[PDB]
């Protein structure tokens, strides 16, 4: 790896600089290099890894959606044929997106998940596994779409089981996991009722636990609860 010669601490320092400069591809490469040093990641370092790849794949997903929409219009009745270029370029972006997801999933499998023993780290990584399989599912169309969907579901489910046993209902990781699993149900699994049920139960159980929190933790938890509410308003 091109980062093999750089100190772990220097990679983390440069990831933070890249974030400030909005150089998210650089940030992801730095954090990949840090993971490949083989040591476990701290809470702050896990966040840096997530921020970097979220922004990289986020741009790819937005581009894929633009191109997919153009491609679908080109396949309507009365649409003048324009050749293979739209499909080709959508496939190009799709392949790069799949490559980023495979990279993240590879880091989780070698060997972040197996070393993660604490609930906070294990749930974080399993949520990430579900998220990146979900992004693969957004673009999947062939024989393996069902298996990709089940891989996302399985990761989210293991994360949910741990989070419910080991974390308070206001924990921001637990909340973000449930938010994302609910989006999976609605947008990927064709299960809108399950999505709505999960969002509502998650919100209500967090509401009942807010009284235990400091002002700062209260702000962290309510921010994610508002996203659950926003989705419920969209879906009902």
């Amino acid at each position: 790896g091109a980062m093999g010669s750089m100190e772990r601490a220097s990679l983390i320092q440069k990831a933070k600089l890249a974030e400030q400069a909005e150089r998210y591809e650089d940030m992801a490469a730095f954090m990949k290099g840090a993971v490949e040093k083989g040591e476990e990641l701290s809470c702050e370092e896990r966040n840096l890894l997530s921020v970097a790849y979220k922004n990289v794949v986020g741009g790819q997903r937005a581009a894929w959606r633009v191109l997919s929409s153009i491609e679908q219009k080109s396949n309507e009745e009365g649409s003048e044929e324009k050749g293979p270029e739209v499909r080709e370029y959508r496939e190009k972006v799709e392949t790069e997106l799949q490559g980023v997801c495979d990279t993240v999933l590879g880091l989780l499998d070698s060997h972040l998940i197996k070393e993660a023993g604490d609930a906070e780290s294990r749930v974080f990584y399993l949520k990430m596994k579900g998220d990146y399989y979900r992004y693969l599912a957004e673009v999947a169309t062939g024989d393996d779409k069902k298996r990709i969907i089940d891989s996302a579901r399985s990761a989210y489910q293991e994360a949910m089981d741990i989070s419910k046993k080991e974390m308070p209902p206001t924990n921001p990781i637990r909340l973000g996991l449930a938010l994302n699993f609910s989006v999976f149900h609605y947008e990927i699994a064709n299960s809108p009722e399950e999505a709505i049920s999960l969002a509502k139960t998650t919100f209500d159980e967090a509401m009942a636990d807010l009284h235990t929190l400091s002002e700062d933790s209260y702000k962290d938890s309510t921010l994610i609860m508002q996203l659950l509410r926003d989705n419920l308003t969209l879906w009902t």
């Binding site: 966040n47 970097a52 909340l175 989006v183 921010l223 996203l227 989705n231």
Partner: peptide, 6 residues
């Protein structure tokens, strides 16, 4: 729909 922020 909104998913979790980093």
């Amino acid at each position: 729909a909104h998913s979790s922020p980093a």
